[PDB]
Design a protein around this motif. Structure first.
Motif, PDB file in Angstrom:
ATOM      1  N   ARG A 278      -1.041   6.356 -17.521  1.00  0.00           N
ATOM      2  CA  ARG A 278      -0.679   5.560 -19.122  1.00  0.00           C
ATOM      3  C   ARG A 278      -1.355   5.943 -20.435  1.00  0.00           C
ATOM      4  O   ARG A 278      -1.334   6.562 -20.836  1.00  0.00           O
ATOM      5  CB  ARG A 278       0.339   4.221 -19.205  1.00  0.00           C
ATOM      6  CG  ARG A 278       0.707   4.369 -17.539  1.00  0.00           C
ATOM      7  CD  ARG A 278       1.599   3.029 -17.563  1.00  0.00           C
ATOM      8  NE  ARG A 278       2.953   2.702 -16.199  1.00  0.00           N
ATOM      9  CZ  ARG A 278       2.893   1.877 -15.684  1.00  0.00           C
ATOM     10  NH1 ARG A 278       2.439   1.021 -15.658  1.00  0.00           N
ATOM     11  NH2 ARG A 278       4.147   1.884 -15.056  1.00  0.00           N
ATOM     12  N   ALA A 279      -1.427   4.590 -20.866  1.00  0.00           N
ATOM     13  CA  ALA A 279      -2.205   4.755 -22.039  1.00  0.00           C
ATOM     14  C   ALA A 279      -2.816   3.411 -22.553  1.00  0.00           C
ATOM     15  O   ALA A 279      -2.026   2.795 -22.138  1.00  0.00           O
ATOM     16  CB  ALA A 279      -0.555   4.836 -23.716  1.00  0.00           C
TER      17      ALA A 279
ATOM     18  N   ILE B  54      -0.731   1.828 -28.208  1.00  0.00           N
ATOM     19  CA  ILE B  54       0.701   1.839 -27.961  1.00  0.00           C
ATOM     20  C   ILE B  54       0.923   1.009 -29.496  1.00  0.00           C
ATOM     21  O   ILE B  54       2.130   1.255 -30.423  1.00  0.00           O
ATOM     22  CB  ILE B  54       1.804   1.907 -27.249  1.00  0.00           C
ATOM     23  CG1 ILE B  54       0.707   2.670 -26.061  1.00  0.00           C
ATOM     24  CG2 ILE B  54       2.955   1.785 -26.694  1.00  0.00           C
ATOM     25  CD1 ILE B  54       1.445   3.928 -26.332  1.00  0.00           C
TER      26      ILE B  54
ATOM     27  N   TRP C 186       2.419  -2.120 -27.158  1.00  0.00           N
ATOM     28  CA  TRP C 186       2.520  -2.087 -25.732  1.00  0.00           C
ATOM     29  C   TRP C 186       3.168  -3.014 -25.629  1.00  0.00           C
ATOM     30  O   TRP C 186       4.449  -2.724 -23.851  1.00  0.00           O
ATOM     31  CB  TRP C 186       0.900  -2.125 -25.245  1.00  0.00           C
ATOM     32  CG  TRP C 186       1.055  -2.362 -23.725  1.00  0.00           C
ATOM     33  CD1 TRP C 186       0.450  -3.173 -23.337  1.00  0.00           C
ATOM     34  CD2 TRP C 186       0.979  -1.371 -22.666  1.00  0.00           C
ATOM     35  NE1 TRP C 186       0.319  -3.330 -22.076  1.00  0.00           N
ATOM     36  CE2 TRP C 186       0.656  -2.225 -22.039  1.00  0.00           C
ATOM     37  CE3 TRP C 186       0.892   0.131 -23.192  1.00  0.00           C
ATOM     38  CZ2 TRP C 186       0.926  -0.932 -20.132  1.00  0.00           C
ATOM     39  CZ3 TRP C 186       0.367   0.937 -22.261  1.00  0.00           C
ATOM     40  CH2 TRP C 186       0.377   0.549 -20.513  1.00  0.00           C
TER      41      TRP C 186
ATOM     42  N   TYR D 234       8.301   1.809 -18.936  1.00  0.00           N
ATOM     43  CA  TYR D 234       7.175   1.741 -17.943  1.00  0.00           C
ATOM     44  C   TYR D 234       7.937   1.428 -16.481  1.00  0.00           C
ATOM     45  O   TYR D 234       7.912   2.101 -15.952  1.00  0.00           O
ATOM     46  CB  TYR D 234       5.983   1.853 -18.050  1.00  0.00           C
ATOM     47  CG  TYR D 234       5.060   2.591 -19.106  1.00  0.00           C
ATOM     48  CD1 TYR D 234       4.435   3.903 -19.350  1.00  0.00           C
ATOM     49  CD2 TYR D 234       4.796   1.723 -20.388  1.00  0.00           C
ATOM     50  CE1 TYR D 234       4.074   4.642 -20.021  1.00  0.00           C
ATOM     51  CE2 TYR D 234       3.762   2.006 -21.276  1.00  0.00           C
ATOM     52  CZ  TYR D 234       3.808   3.285 -20.872  1.00  0.00           C
ATOM     53  OH  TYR D 234       3.169   4.457 -21.930  1.00  0.00           O
TER      54      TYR D 234
ATOM     55  N   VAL E  39      -1.443  10.092 -27.100  1.00  0.00           N
ATOM     56  CA  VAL E  39      -2.148   9.376 -26.112  1.00  0.00           C
ATOM     57  C   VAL E  39      -3.238   9.475 -24.706  1.00  0.00           C
ATOM     58  O   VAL E  39      -3.427  10.404 -24.802  1.00  0.00           O
ATOM     59  CB  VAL E  39      -0.733   8.441 -25.398  1.00  0.00           C
ATOM     60  CG1 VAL E  39       0.214   8.214 -26.127  1.00  0.00           C
ATOM     61  CG2 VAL E  39       0.103   9.468 -24.599  1.00  0.00           C
TER      62      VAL E  39
ATOM     63  N   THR F  21       4.464   7.944 -20.350  1.00  0.00           N
ATOM     64  CA  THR F  21       4.581   7.296 -21.779  1.00  0.00           C
ATOM     65  C   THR F  21       6.809   8.126 -22.248  1.00  0.00           C
ATOM     66  O   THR F  21       6.798   7.513 -22.718  1.00  0.00           O
ATOM     67  CB  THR F  21       3.950   7.740 -22.519  1.00  0.00           C
ATOM     68  OG1 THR F  21       2.842   6.958 -22.164  1.00  0.00           O
ATOM     69  CG2 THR F  21       4.259   6.999 -23.961  1.00  0.00           C
TER      70      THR F  21
END
Ligand SMILES: Cc1cc2c(cc1C)N(C[C@H](O)[C@H](O)[C@H](O)COP(=O)(O)OP(=O)(O)OC[C@H]1O[C@@H](n3cnc4c(N)ncnc43)[C@H](O)[C@@H]1O)c1[nH]c(=O)[nH]c(=O)c1N2
Length: 563
Positions: A96-97, A102, A115, A122, A539, A546
């Motif tokens: 993800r990140a 985010i 986020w 997600y 990211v 994402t």
């Protein structure tokens, strides 16, 4: 030939939007896809088939201009031409990140994009298969709280996953270097070593691409329509703020026709196509449009600007014997990579930020303001230096036999480039310029990461398994060599990391954004871009997770706007 919604691009993001909008049986959705099914394509379905599809008929193989800050060569930028898009040819990694990266989307002016706003999406997208005990013995792990159990995208670990000498050794070597094993890199804190999950249907042992996830299980919906082997050329408009009437298409027989949208057109053709579709429709920089025989409809000159990509290099070692085990990812911070040299690296970067921003202004001929670029670069700097987000991804895996392979990339280079049409002919190749290696940090960080990988290969206990480094190897780059010799070798041997973002960036229009915080293109009533084009920054992780979450979120925003 009239539908509520037309989704241009049956790829990673576009299939999510078409799936979610067609949940209402009274809403008709048309998908336009230039490719066709890859349900039976063995280069796609093979869970261990990454790379097989490169250069094939399902790879767009887009070509950059000569990369003048790097080795002066044209670089391929691969992308999927298939139902499922680039999810059909990618490496299948699901990561993800960083939460704070985010959160910066809201800091830059996108209200409601943090986020915690994206996290439920997600989860909505994902169905993780929990690891078995042998998979747990190989190092597979997850945090149940951050993984979905019922979404369309199946995620999990290979049934072939087994602990082996290489992955045990790498885990222990990174831990000794101060980089801990983390159970889950998808909970917003990515730093560490991890046995990452993949977009895999574990029961079928096949790649879980976006069509297998979001299209085929739903394809008998009577309100969901597909026109495969069909190319979108441009949007056409109602006869002021622009209202899209529909999309002009070319079919396999070469005939040009129109399809009409009653509500909205969603452009999901990927970061290297969605901005071109906008330009061909008259949405973009009027000077570029008029030069290319297009009548401007919306003066939005940052369409195609703010292209950000990463670049990937590879290293390799040879064991005394056979090497086996899990595939690993490591996400080191700046201090993990640079150790005692960190403060020096940071000071050098700090001293250059303003100059980077000044140079980037010229890339768009001033359609991004210096002050806005400095603000954006300061946000990225703070993520690197203050939040200590990972600066690299390092993959290690068994290469076959005695080989260990590593693939790695700097996550947050500062170079920005652009993509623009080269004519009004929809088939003409775009001018694509990522400006790889434009800024000193971009190469210096890459070199730091490469030297770190060389050090890990020589560190205990992994060193007991490794006879020598083979790529670049000590003959090509002796350990006594200066940093410039690393930068030279990296420039000669890199490829695109195939991670482009930003070409229809979500930012306020006043600071150069192309879409608002509901993904609507400025100056239009009913056009959205929903794909990697809208990410305003890179990211740290692999893009599909994402992009699925962004497309899931966009689908809710579209539904709200229809009510
Ligand atoms: C080789 C390689 C390796 C990796 C990755 C990429 C690549 C190329 N990535 C990145 C990730 O796969 C990629 O960023 C996303 O799939 C892109 O999704 P989008 O929806 O932006 O575009 P995507 O490219 O998926 O979709 C665009 C769709 O539009 C279609 N199209 C384009 N122009 C059109 C037109 N004019 N008319 C009609 N249709 C048109 C295309 O054919 C395509 O189906 C990755 N990510 C990850 O999470 N894990 C990984 O391991 C990897 N590894």
């Amino acid at each position: 030939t009239t539908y509520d919604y037309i989704v241009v691009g049956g790829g990673t993001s576009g299939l999510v939007v078409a799936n979610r909008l067609s949940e209402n049986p009274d809403v008709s959705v048309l998908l336009l896809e230039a490719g066709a099914s890859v349900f039976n394509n063995p280069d796609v379905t093979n869970a261990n088939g990454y790379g097989l599809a490169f250069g094939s008929a399902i790879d767009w193989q887009y070509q950059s201009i000569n990369q003048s800050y790097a080795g002066g060569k044209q670089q391929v930028l691969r992308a999927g031409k298939a139902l499922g898009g680039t999810s059909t040819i990618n490496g299948m990694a699901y990561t993800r990140a960083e939460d704070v990266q985010i959160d910066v989307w809201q800091k830059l002016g996108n209200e409601g994009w943090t986020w915690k706003d994206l996290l439920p999406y997600y989860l909505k997208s994902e169905n993780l298969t929990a690891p078995t005990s042998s998979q747990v013995a190989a190092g597979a792990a997850y945090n149940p709280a951050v993984n979905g159990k019922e979404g369309p995208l199946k995620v999990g670990w290979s049934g072939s996953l087994a602990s082996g000498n290489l992955s045990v050794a790498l885990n222990r070597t990174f831990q000794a270097a101060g980089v801990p094993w983390v159970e889950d890199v998808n909970g917003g804190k990515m730093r560490g070593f991890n046995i990452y999950p993949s977009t895999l249907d574990v029961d079928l042992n096949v790649r879980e691409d976006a069509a297998r996830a979001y299209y085929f299980p739903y394809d008998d919906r009577k309100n969901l329509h597909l026109l495969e082997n069909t190319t979108a050329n441009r949007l056409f408009w109602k006869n002021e703020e622009a209202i899209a009437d529909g999309v002009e298409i070319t079919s396999a027989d070469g005939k040009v026709t129109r399809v009409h949208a009653k509500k909205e057109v969603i452009i999901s053709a990927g970061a290297l196509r969605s901005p071109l579709i906008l330009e061909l429709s008259g949405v973009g920089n009027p000077t570029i449009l008029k030069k290319n025989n297009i009548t401007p409809r919306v003066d939005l000159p940052t369409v195609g600007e703010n292209l950000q990509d990463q670049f990937n290099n590879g290293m390799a070692g040879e064991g005394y014997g056979v090497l086996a085990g899990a595939s690993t990812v490591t996400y080191p911070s700046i201090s993990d990579v640079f150790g005692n040299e960190t403060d020096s690296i940071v000071a050098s970067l700090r001293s250059q930020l303003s100059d980077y921003a000044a140079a980037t202004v010229k890339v768009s001929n001033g359609h991004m303001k210096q002050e806005d670029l400095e603000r954006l670069y300061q946000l990225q700097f703070d993520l690197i230096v203050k939040d200590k987000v990972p600066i690299a991804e390092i993959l290690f895996h068994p290469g076959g036999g005695n080989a260990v392979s590593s693939e790695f990339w700097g996550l947050l280079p500062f170079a920005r480039g652009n993509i623009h049409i080269s004519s009004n002919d929809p088939t003409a190749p775009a001018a694509i310029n990522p400006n790889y290696f434009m800024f000193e940090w971009d190469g210096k960080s890459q070199a730091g990461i490469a030297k770190y990988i060389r050090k890990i290969l020589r560190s205990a206990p992994l060193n007991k398994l490794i006879a020598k480094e083979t790529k670049p190897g000590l003959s090509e780059i002796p350990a006594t060599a200066a940093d410039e010799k690393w930068v030279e070798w990296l420039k000669a041997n890199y490829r695109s990391n195939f991670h482009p973002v930003g070409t229809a960036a979500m930012m306020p229009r006043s600071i150069g954004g192309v879409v608002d915080n509901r993904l609507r293109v400025y100056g239009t009533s009913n056009v959205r871009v929903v794909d990697a084009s809208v990410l305003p920054f890179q990211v740290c992780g692999h893009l599909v997770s994402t992009l699925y979450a962004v497309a899931e979120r966009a689908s809710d925003l579209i539904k709200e706007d229809a009510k």
